[PDB]
Amino acid sequence: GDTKEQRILRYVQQNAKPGDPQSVLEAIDTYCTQKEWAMNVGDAKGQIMDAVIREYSPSLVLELGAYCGYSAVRMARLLQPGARLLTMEINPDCAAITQQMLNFAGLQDKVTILNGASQDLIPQLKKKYDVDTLDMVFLDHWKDRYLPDTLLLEKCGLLRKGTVLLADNVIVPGTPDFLAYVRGSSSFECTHYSSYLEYMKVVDGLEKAIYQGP
Numbered sequence: 385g386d387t388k389e390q391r392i393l394r395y396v397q398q399n400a401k402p403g404d405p406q407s408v409l410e411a412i413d414t415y416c417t418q419k420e421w422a423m424n425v426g427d428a429k430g431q432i433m434d435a436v437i438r439e440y441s442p443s444l445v446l447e448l449g450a451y452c453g454y455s456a457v458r459m460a461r462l463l464q465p466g467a468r469l470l471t472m473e474i475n476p477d478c479a480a481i482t483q484q485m486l487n488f489a490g491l492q493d494k495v496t497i498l499n500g501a502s503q504d505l506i507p508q509l510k511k512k513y514d515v516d517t518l519d520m521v522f523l524d525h526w527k528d529r530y531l532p533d534t535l536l537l538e539k540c541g542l543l544r545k546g547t548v549l550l551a552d553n554v555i556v557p558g559t560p561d562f563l564a565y566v567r568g569s570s571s572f573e574c575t576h577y578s579s580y581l582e583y584m585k586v587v588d589g590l591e592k593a594i595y596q597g598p
């Protein structure tokens with residue numbers, strides 16, 4: 385039958401207001417609290433994301449890992465007119481859910497959903513997607529890819545002085561190599577925001593790592 389992700393989308397469509405991103409977030413969080421847990425960033429960590437997005441007002445954001453579009457909705461709703469989000473999603477079913485979620489939220493003009501693997505798509509961003517440098521990157525994909533993709537972004541010339549990396553799940557499931565690397569590197573200024581795993585009384589956190597140049 386249908387998947388959990390399809391059930392979340394249907395729930396939003398039937399319990400939120402079209403064109404109202406905040407109602408979409410609330411519907412997803414209610415469903416995942418009351419019905420079925422899912423790996424959306426959630427409201428606890430989402431409030432920290434909101435505070436970071438507001439501080440930096442990024443013009444161009446890259447997200448690695450869309451899932452059902454919760455974080456894309458959360459970020460895109462706070463972007464200024466004309467600012468853009470690119471989100472990379474390897475799972476085609478999830479890419480389709482994410483697109484439909486964004487469409488329902490009315491945020492489709494702000495967001496472009498790329499369906500492929502980060503190691504394949506990151507080297508295409510400049511020539512194929514006309515990116516110069518990124519203002520912010522949200523890491524929320526395979527936890528063992530946070531470090532290699534950070535290094536690939538740098539190799540590809542996509543980071544500038546001040547680019548903000550914000551990483552989900554640095555505690556659970558955990559990203560130990562990424563944390564050790566950025567915290568030990570003079571090329572990053574790092575801050576840890578302690579919080580909770582989505583929908584659970586389990587400690588998690590976000591790491592902010594601001595790129596400082598070579």
Ligand SMILES: O=C(NCC/C=C/Cn1ccc2cnccc21)c1cc(-c2ccc(F)cc2)cc(O)c1O
Nearest residue numbers: 423448449472473474501502524525526553556557
């Ligand atoms: O695995 C998670 N996320 C990643 C999903 C797919 C990546 C695959 N993926 C998506 C684009 C892309 C692009 N390129 C390569 C792979 C890619 C995740 C997992 C948990 C979690 C926590 C506790 C627990 F008991 C079980 C699971 C919490 C979370 O908040 C997550 O975010």
Ligand SMILES: [Cl-]
Nearest residue numbers: 424425454455
């Ligand atoms: Cl999410």
Ligand SMILES: [Cl-]
Nearest residue numbers: 426427428583
């Ligand atoms: Cl939560």
Ligand SMILES: [Mg+2]
Nearest residue numbers: 425524552553
């Ligand atoms: Mg996550």
